[PDB]
Amino acid sequence: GVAAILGPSHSSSANAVQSICNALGVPHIQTRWKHQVSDNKDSFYVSLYPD
Amino acid sequence: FSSLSRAILDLVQFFKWKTVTVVYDDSTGLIRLQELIKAPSRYNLRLKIR
Fold first, then answer.
1. A9-37 in b/e burial notation, b at 16+ Cβ within 10 A?
2. Half-sphere exposure of residue A33, counting CA atoms within 13 Å on the CB side?
3. Phi then psi for B45, rounded to 5 degrees?
4. CA-to-CA dists, residue B17 to A6, A45, B29, B42, angstroms
5. What positions belong to coiled-coil segments (chain B)?
6. Closest C-alpha among B25, B26, A32 to residue A15
């Protein structure tokens, strides 16, 4: 148990992380740019990275 | 879509086009077409995208 995870810096498993987080409701914070999937209706994520 | 891009490029050249526009849906189409997108380096092709 935590408040939130810090995302791994590579998109491949990053998607796993994210589809985990919003699946179990814990907010997710990402640092590395990922491939924005156009219709990923996830809602528990932000990214400090310059978009 | 790699080899597809080669074939498309062949078709383009066979028609001898000297201008063209590529249009996609979402940015993934880029990856889908990168090979053609690399047209200008080899032959005289000007292509644009929207």
1. eebeebeebbeebbeeeeebebeeebeee
2. 4
3. -135, 125
4. 50, 46, 22, 14
5. none
6. A32
